[PDB]
Scaffold this motif. Sequence first.
Motif, PDB file in Angstrom:
ATOM      1  N   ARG A 245      -4.320  12.274 -36.496  1.00  0.00           N
ATOM      2  CA  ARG A 245      -5.289  11.621 -35.627  1.00  0.00           C
ATOM      3  C   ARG A 245      -5.513  10.158 -35.987  1.00  0.00           C
ATOM      4  O   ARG A 245      -6.422   9.529 -35.437  1.00  0.00           O
ATOM      5  CB  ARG A 245      -6.619  12.375 -35.660  1.00  0.00           C
ATOM      6  N   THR A 249      -5.633   8.083 -32.717  1.00  0.00           N
ATOM      7  CA  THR A 249      -4.938   9.331 -32.370  1.00  0.00           C
ATOM      8  C   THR A 249      -3.435   9.128 -32.150  1.00  0.00           C
ATOM      9  O   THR A 249      -2.746  10.017 -31.636  1.00  0.00           O
ATOM     10  CB  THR A 249      -5.594  10.030 -31.165  1.00  0.00           C
ATOM     11  N   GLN A 271       3.276   7.347 -29.497  1.00  0.00           N
ATOM     12  CA  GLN A 271       2.540   7.883 -28.364  1.00  0.00           C
ATOM     13  C   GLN A 271       1.234   8.496 -28.848  1.00  0.00           C
ATOM     14  O   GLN A 271       1.159   9.050 -29.948  1.00  0.00           O
ATOM     15  CB  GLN A 271       3.365   8.930 -27.611  1.00  0.00           C
ATOM     16  N   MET A 272       0.205   8.388 -28.015  1.00  0.00           N
ATOM     17  CA  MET A 272      -1.114   8.886 -28.373  1.00  0.00           C
ATOM     18  C   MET A 272      -1.242  10.368 -28.046  1.00  0.00           C
ATOM     19  O   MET A 272      -0.625  10.875 -27.104  1.00  0.00           O
ATOM     20  CB  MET A 272      -2.201   8.090 -27.651  1.00  0.00           C
ATOM     21  N   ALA A 273      -2.048  11.063 -28.850  1.00  0.00           N
ATOM     22  CA  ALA A 273      -2.308  12.496 -28.722  1.00  0.00           C
ATOM     23  C   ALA A 273      -1.043  13.337 -28.874  1.00  0.00           C
ATOM     24  O   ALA A 273      -1.011  14.497 -28.452  1.00  0.00           O
ATOM     25  CB  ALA A 273      -3.004  12.823 -27.396  1.00  0.00           C
ATOM     26  N   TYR A 275       0.166  14.068 -31.872  1.00  0.00           N
ATOM     27  CA  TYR A 275       0.045  14.682 -33.195  1.00  0.00           C
ATOM     28  C   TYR A 275       1.247  14.351 -34.081  1.00  0.00           C
ATOM     29  O   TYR A 275       1.985  15.225 -34.538  1.00  0.00           O
ATOM     30  CB  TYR A 275      -0.181  16.193 -33.091  1.00  0.00           C
ATOM     31  N   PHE A 278       1.741  16.515 -37.614  1.00  0.00           N
ATOM     32  CA  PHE A 278       1.400  17.934 -37.614  1.00  0.00           C
ATOM     33  C   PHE A 278       2.196  18.686 -38.672  1.00  0.00           C
ATOM     34  O   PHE A 278       1.660  19.565 -39.357  1.00  0.00           O
ATOM     35  CB  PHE A 278       1.646  18.522 -36.225  1.00  0.00           C
ATOM     36  N   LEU A 299       3.419  17.511 -29.562  1.00  0.00           N
ATOM     37  CA  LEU A 299       2.795  17.207 -28.283  1.00  0.00           C
ATOM     38  C   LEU A 299       3.369  15.959 -27.627  1.00  0.00           C
ATOM     39  O   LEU A 299       2.799  15.468 -26.649  1.00  0.00           O
ATOM     40  CB  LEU A 299       1.284  17.052 -28.460  1.00  0.00           C
ATOM     41  N   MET A 301       5.256  13.429 -25.332  1.00  0.00           N
ATOM     42  CA  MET A 301       5.654  13.452 -23.930  1.00  0.00           C
ATOM     43  C   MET A 301       6.676  12.351 -23.686  1.00  0.00           C
ATOM     44  O   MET A 301       6.381  11.170 -23.892  1.00  0.00           O
ATOM     45  CB  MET A 301       4.440  13.273 -23.018  1.00  0.00           C
ATOM     46  N   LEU A 309       6.272  12.055 -17.293  1.00  0.00           N
ATOM     47  CA  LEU A 309       6.077  12.459 -18.678  1.00  0.00           C
ATOM     48  C   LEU A 309       6.036  13.979 -18.785  1.00  0.00           C
ATOM     49  O   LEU A 309       5.291  14.643 -18.058  1.00  0.00           O
ATOM     50  CB  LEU A 309       4.786  11.857 -19.229  1.00  0.00           C
ATOM     51  N   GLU A 311       5.827  17.156 -21.747  1.00  0.00           N
ATOM     52  CA  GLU A 311       5.511  17.465 -23.139  1.00  0.00           C
ATOM     53  C   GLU A 311       6.604  18.359 -23.705  1.00  0.00           C
ATOM     54  O   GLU A 311       6.630  19.566 -23.457  1.00  0.00           O
ATOM     55  CB  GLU A 311       4.143  18.129 -23.244  1.00  0.00           C
ATOM     56  N   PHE A 337       6.391  22.054 -22.937  1.00  0.00           N
ATOM     57  CA  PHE A 337       5.283  22.830 -23.495  1.00  0.00           C
ATOM     58  C   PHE A 337       5.737  23.798 -24.579  1.00  0.00           C
ATOM     59  O   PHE A 337       5.106  24.838 -24.791  1.00  0.00           O
ATOM     60  CB  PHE A 337       4.522  23.589 -22.402  1.00  0.00           C
ATOM     61  N   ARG A 339       6.310  22.715 -27.874  1.00  0.00           N
ATOM     62  CA  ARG A 339       5.820  22.202 -29.153  1.00  0.00           C
ATOM     63  C   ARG A 339       6.938  22.210 -30.202  1.00  0.00           C
ATOM     64  O   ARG A 339       6.916  22.944 -31.190  1.00  0.00           O
ATOM     65  CB  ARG A 339       4.589  22.989 -29.619  1.00  0.00           C
ATOM     66  N   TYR A 364       6.537  28.109 -28.890  1.00  0.00           N
ATOM     67  CA  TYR A 364       6.207  28.511 -27.527  1.00  0.00           C
ATOM     68  C   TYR A 364       7.352  28.238 -26.561  1.00  0.00           C
ATOM     69  O   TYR A 364       7.123  28.083 -25.358  1.00  0.00           O
ATOM     70  CB  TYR A 364       4.928  27.812 -27.068  1.00  0.00           C
ATOM     71  N   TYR A 406       6.078  29.480 -35.928  1.00  0.00           N
ATOM     72  CA  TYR A 406       4.907  28.705 -36.323  1.00  0.00           C
ATOM     73  C   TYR A 406       4.920  28.404 -37.815  1.00  0.00           C
ATOM     74  O   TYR A 406       4.373  27.383 -38.248  1.00  0.00           O
ATOM     75  CB  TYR A 406       3.632  29.454 -35.940  1.00  0.00           C
TER      76      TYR A 406
END
Lengths: 737, 465, 66
Positions: A245, A249, A271-273, A275, A278, A299, A301, A309, A311, A337, A339, A364, A406
């Motif tokens: 963050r 972020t 890029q923002m958000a 992560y 992680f 995350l 994009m 964009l 993800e 999507f 991740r 995922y 994970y």
Amino acid sequence: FNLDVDSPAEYSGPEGSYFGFAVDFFVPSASSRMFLLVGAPKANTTQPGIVEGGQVLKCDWSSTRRCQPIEFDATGNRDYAKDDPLEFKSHQWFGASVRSKQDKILACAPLYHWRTEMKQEREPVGTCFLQDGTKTVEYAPCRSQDIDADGQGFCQGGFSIDFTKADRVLLGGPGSFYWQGQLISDQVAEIVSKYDPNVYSIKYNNQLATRTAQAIFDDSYLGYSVAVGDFNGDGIDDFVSGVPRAARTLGMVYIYDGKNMSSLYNFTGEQMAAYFGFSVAATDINGDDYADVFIGAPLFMDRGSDGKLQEVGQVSVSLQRASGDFQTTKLNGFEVFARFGSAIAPLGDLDQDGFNDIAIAAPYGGEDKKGIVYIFNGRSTGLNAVPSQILEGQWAARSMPPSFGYSMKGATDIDKNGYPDLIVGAFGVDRAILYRARPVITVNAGLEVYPSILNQDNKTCSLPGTALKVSCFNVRFCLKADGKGVLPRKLNFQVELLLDKLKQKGAIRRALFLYSRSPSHSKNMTISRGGLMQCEELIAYLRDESEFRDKLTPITIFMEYRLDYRTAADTTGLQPILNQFTPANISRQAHILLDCGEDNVCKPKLEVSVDSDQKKIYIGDDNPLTLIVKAQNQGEGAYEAELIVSIPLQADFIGVVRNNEALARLSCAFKTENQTRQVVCDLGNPMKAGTQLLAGLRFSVHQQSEMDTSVKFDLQIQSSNLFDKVSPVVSHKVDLA
Amino acid sequence: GPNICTTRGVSSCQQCLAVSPMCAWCSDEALPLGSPRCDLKENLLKDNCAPESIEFPVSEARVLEDRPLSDKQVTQVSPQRIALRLRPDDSKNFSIQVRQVEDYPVDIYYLMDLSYSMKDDLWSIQNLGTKLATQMRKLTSNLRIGFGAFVDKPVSPYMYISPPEALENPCYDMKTTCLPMFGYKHVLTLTDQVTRFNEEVKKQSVSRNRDAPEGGFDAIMQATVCDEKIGWRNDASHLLVFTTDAKTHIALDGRLAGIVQPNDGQCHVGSDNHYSASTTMDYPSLGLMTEKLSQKNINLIFAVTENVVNLYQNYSELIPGTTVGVLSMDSSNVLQLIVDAYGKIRSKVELEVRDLPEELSLSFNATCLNNEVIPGLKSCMGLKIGDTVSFSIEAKVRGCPQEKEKSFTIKPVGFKDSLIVQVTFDCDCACQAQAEPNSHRCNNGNGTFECGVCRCGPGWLGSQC
Amino acid sequence: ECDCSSPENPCCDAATCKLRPGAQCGEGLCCEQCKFSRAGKICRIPRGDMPDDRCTGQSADCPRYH
Ligand SMILES: *[C@@H]1O[C@H](CO)[C@@H](O[C@@H]2O[C@H](CO)[C@@H](O[C@@H]3O[C@H](CO[C@@H]4O[C@H](CO)[C@@H](O[C@H]5O[C@H](CO)[C@@H](O)[C@H](O)[C@@H]5O)[C@H](O)[C@@H]4O)[C@@H](O)[C@H](O[C@H]4O[C@H](CO)[C@@H](O)[C@H](O)[C@@H]4O)[C@@H]3O)[C@H](O)[C@H]2NC(C)=O)[C@H](O)[C@H]1NC(C)=O
Ligand SMILES: *[C@@H]1O[C@H](CO)[C@@H](O[C@@H]2O[C@H](CO)[C@@H](O[C@@H]3O[C@H](CO)[C@@H](O)[C@H](O)[C@@H]3O)[C@H](O)[C@H]2NC(C)=O)[C@H](O)[C@H]1NC(C)=O
Ligand SMILES: *[C@@H]1O[C@H](CO)[C@@H](O[C@@H]2O[C@H](CO)[C@@H](O[C@@H]3O[C@H](CO)[C@@H](O)[C@H](O)[C@@H]3O)[C@H](O)[C@H]2NC(C)=O)[C@H](O)[C@H]1NC(C)=O
Ligand SMILES: *[C@@H]1O[C@H](CO)[C@@H](O[C@@H]2O[C@H](CO)[C@@H](O)[C@H](O)[C@H]2NC(C)=O)[C@H](O)[C@H]1NC(C)=O
Ligand SMILES: *[C@@H]1O[C@H](CO)[C@@H](O[C@@H]2O[C@H](CO)[C@@H](O)[C@H](O)[C@H]2NC(C)=O)[C@H](O)[C@H]1NC(C)=O
Ligand SMILES: *[C@@H]1O[C@H](CO)[C@@H](O[C@@H]2O[C@H](CO)[C@@H](O)[C@H](O)[C@H]2NC(C)=O)[C@H](O)[C@H]1NC(C)=O
Ligand SMILES: *[C@@H]1O[C@H](CO)[C@@H](O[C@@H]2O[C@H](CO)[C@@H](O)[C@H](O)[C@H]2NC(C)=O)[C@H](O)[C@H]1NC(C)=O
Ligand SMILES: *[C@@H]1O[C@H](CO)[C@@H](O)[C@H](O)[C@H]1NC(C)=O
Ligand SMILES: *[C@@H]1O[C@H](CO)[C@@H](O)[C@H](O)[C@H]1NC(C)=O
Ligand SMILES: [Ca+2]
Ligand SMILES: [Ca+2]
Ligand SMILES: [Ca+2]
Ligand SMILES: [Ca+2]
Ligand SMILES: [Ca+2]
Ligand SMILES: [Ca+2]
Ligand SMILES: [Ca+2]
């Protein structure tokens, strides 16, 4: 590419226990047995008055697939006073982070809550339990007296943990100092020696910790992920931490000195958000003893095919150089999507090639959102951008996504076969899966042929059954296979030899073996590892010089070798694998000797001419028309030479003139294929140089439309040669009278 | 000369009328037997047929109501009552004009940050809500408005879970009273009661949590995906106004709280008007938020304080189609964004035909703003209030039915007004009403005589039996 | 009895350690060029979910609006 996916060792925990949330290997230095360390942060323990405190289970791999919990803590909540619970172990998420050195096991409870020594509170300081085989101590660096949101009260220590080479514990709590985050390093020996149950705010000497920063660094989450590696001159392990963050972020990765917790180098996201931070991994991917940094941004994009964009996630690979420079590349995700950069697990040298590999999982991704794991093999220039193997989740979601991938752990050889293994945890279905790497067999296959130019006239070869004495040529193919790790000395290979490759499309085959009398020969091999080129001799004979279609297309010799896979290590059948980046087949070319000048290719000059000898025909009758055609090749050999007489819709062919010796008796045929009827006549295979043909063709013409005024023919010679294979088109006209 | 009339309509008057639009019939006995009775009107005149005995009804359009299209009940389709007289196997064309003068229906949902950092911005956000309602009431006459609220996920470490007096009063540690913490609260459904919206907006008060980032994206996703709960109208423009004064929690932030389940985008607001999956589902990601906003056609608007304007501008760069405004004592920036969003509304005129008779057929020419006639197209795009579009519709009927009268309604999709027709099929001749039953006038035979001609029954194939 | 703690503060007269004419403050977050800051001005960004500390417009120090 060598991970065994057909029969992996599947482990299961209690329902809803998050079994497989944290995975690790247990390799005791005093025992020959190895165990899987699986954390179940939501499991129900036997602690009195504790609900869903979580536990860490050690799983036996040798047999029965049994998992038994490790009793790090058997007592419930301690009391500060008569009615005053000092701690709150319910829903403490014990087992969310499991790390193991030789004999030490580090299991942490990030959501462990504590009632401080000043006022009745519930602060998620987090706690860890360090077990050295016999003595289990408690490590709570963030349980100090600096207790508040602006202190270490919400530190949640043990969110991420790691082990250094010098017996140090790197601990990350992303809640310290109003969620700025903190890194805390302590010596294992100091942790064991300084432990005392009565004192809760134990102060450890030689402890390296990051201090609080300015308020503009709040909610950065330093210590979300941790990694250890060497990034300066000395041999000590430096501290790599993801700060997902940070930088508004954007995400950042802080590298700290492993000697005095001094800032070394920084990574920043684009890029923002997304992560950025992680997951962080530190391993040498190009095999030059400089640790590289792998940062996941699950995350992220990127721009799609339509400019929108999407993800997909991203992993940033930074290669360490001799100086402090880093060579950074990017690895984008494959599914939206999914991740992609969620988990990055170094695998060591999975195929024992020389460069360490790494596993990146999109928990995922795949079909039904089960989860997917990507294996990337390191190269001398870095990392191969194309994954070599794909691991798919095989369990459907019950209430929550299976999250296969994970958490992953690797770089440990659990079956003593020489290659590192990989545990994948799917805590959504409460499963832990162990994948075993297979031995890689590198095969140096060769195929030698006696001189590629074959002479049809040279027929000094006997035959079985008839002894027709037709030309022959030899084929020699050699096989040697070597590999690392556990592998039996003798490997079984079966090789197949197919002649006339790239030409076998239901047509004729020219090259035949002397004894089998078949274009296809299969032989089984029993070759030894590290042995010599096992070469065998076979004899192949060509057909008659005027039997096959043509002598221009080269004869192609195809060898296909495959490894017989009943090669087990007497452990439930772990078959070996062949190297992915090796030619599974080898093909050589053989040519036919044909006098075609120095350039080794025949370049003919084809000419055609015709006279009328009638110059006029009358409309109402069926007039016999004979065309005198001269077909000459003043160039070199013309292969499969025939002249094409494309007669119009009017006339038809009668026959070749044989009543005179000045003309020839050419074999002729009437063809109608592909919208055009025409007459073909064989001119000789091959059509030799300077050969002048003269013959006549009889016809019969009856006009179609009463106003036609002419009858036009077209003559052209063509051959199957590659250059100057056609004559100029000559059009002969006969006038109607 | 000999034509399709002389070859198909010679049987009798009704069939002659049915043959072709330009076929004409003669009902004069002076015409000698042998000359065609069905031909061109000019041909009939050349054949000295009596003009009064010529039955040539021409298909035409009779406009009945033509009050002009209204300008800013409003007249939205002109003409609105057109009478069609179609002879069998004929095509007639008529023109209509559709003008959008009714104001756009707009749905505005207002999301309020009711955290403790908003104690000095509560007045600003309430004033913004009231000014929003007033501005859209003066901008469009079809406004539906509602609002909700959010703080953050009600779990540790965000909530004050201790002492037990801090559960119902998060400001217990600071010796004040605040509302209990919640994740998302749908307070008012989208309603046209602006006074009710103002009262409910003014009744709101703030709550308290621990960390600066808030769970506003959870509220955004819930308001986007809970269509039935929020009250979104399908045929309307949806504006979601998001108000906050701090940073925002994003996806993967919930691992600290112990939440590792990704947001699935489904609706989790029950009868209690609360986000029931706040403590079990992670914060939504930007990609999922953008996908849901695009799916639901919701125009997100960020009304944020000055300290976070740049942060949310960059967020809106990551989320295409989103605008950011400065929330302050005056609401000029957000009101201007709302005005621009309303001005970026474009309407489409989709022509629909109801209960059209099977025998009838329709052809559509669209004269959109490009002023280019596009045959085969019936729905122009773009369009604004007051803007007009025109259509040329040609109606053709296969033969003629026995109804002698049919009516169908031409309506533009989403338009209150409509155009009706009165399709009066001739299908016969005026002289046929004065037909003679049988025999008598038609010589000694027993056929039937009408319109100056006779047509016998079975057996008698003669001209006059 | 001195409005300025530091004797070298130009906002206060050196002779009597009192505020010079035309000046109302000598120190503080809400004090600008020896004058009070405009009311409603943010002067202390807080930590966590806390409201901003504003300027009262009649004093030189931020009130405890925590
Ligand atoms: C990778 O990225 C990291 C994150 O960006 C980098 O870490 C950052 O490095 C900065 C320096 O490069 C560092 O800034 C220095 O912070 C210390 C902190 O000491 C302070 O001590 C004060 C008294 O207790 C308190 O804050 C005072 O100062 C602030 C203004 O900074 C006021 O607003 C406060 O009211 C208060 O008066 C704090 O308790 C804090 O602990 C400072 O001492 C340093 O001051 C130096 O620079 C200033 C000029 O800026 C000089 O006037 C002064 O004399 C000193 O020479 C710096 O401001 C960040 O704290 C740090 N942040 C984090 C999260 O690590 C990292 O460096 C980078 N590495 C690489 C290799 O790129
Ligand atoms: C570990 O053991 C605890 C036992 O305390 C389990 O918690 C219990 O889970 C059940 C659900 O199977 C809860 O029942 C619930 O009751 C409420 C009404 O209060 C009802 O609305 C729900 O539909 C459900 O039936 C029970 O209350 C709960 N007990 C607690 C929290 O004290 C927990 O599930 C176990 N976890 C694992 C991973 O084994
Ligand atoms: C006509 O065809 C025959 C095939 O029956 C050719 O005889 C083979 O020619 C190869 C090379 O062209 C020779 O093999 C040699 O063997 C020695 C060992 O004795 C080895 O050291 C060499 O490297 C080479 O492999 C040999 O003369 C003979 N081999 C066999 C198995 O028959 C003949 O050369 C052809 N002649 C012409 C003019 O094309
Ligand atoms: C912490 O360790 C680092 C490296 O071990 C020290 O950095 C060196 O400091 C000396 C003296 O200040 C310099 O001459 C070197 O050039 C530095 N090396 C670098 C920056 O790579 C640092 O001084 C130590 N102490 C701290 C950070 O307080
Ligand atoms: C021969 O080996 C080659 C690789 O050395 C392979 O042929 C390829 O097969 C893959 C998988 O189907 C295809 O994607 C490639 O397009 C093929 N390339 C070529 C050159 O054919 C395969 O292992 C073997 N192929 C045959 C026909 O034996
Ligand atoms: C929002 O995005 C802009 C554009 O990237 C950021 O502006 C940059 O800020 C950095 C600060 O480190 C400067 O070095 C750049 O020069 C700035 N670029 C431009 C074009 O202004 C801005 O900081 C971002 N703000 C937030 C809150 O994320
Ligand atoms: C739509 O416009 C086209 C083009 O103007 C019309 O087609 C014309 O019809 C008339 C009358 O039959 C002809 O004289 C023209 O030659 C036609 N032009 C073309 C290019 O087709 C069509 O009738 C119109 N349809 C409607 C329903 O208005
Ligand atoms: C080679 O192996 C195949 C299949 O394993 C077998 O059918 C064949 O008989 C073997 N050939 C010899 C010579 O053993
Ligand atoms: C029908 O189309 C013709 C052109 O073919 C045009 O002259 C006429 O005006 C149209 N009918 C109406 C009612 O506009
Ligand atoms: Ca080092
Ligand atoms: Ca390296
Ligand atoms: Ca490798
Ligand atoms: Ca192994
Ligand atoms: Ca040549
Ligand atoms: Ca505020
Ligand atoms: Ca918050």
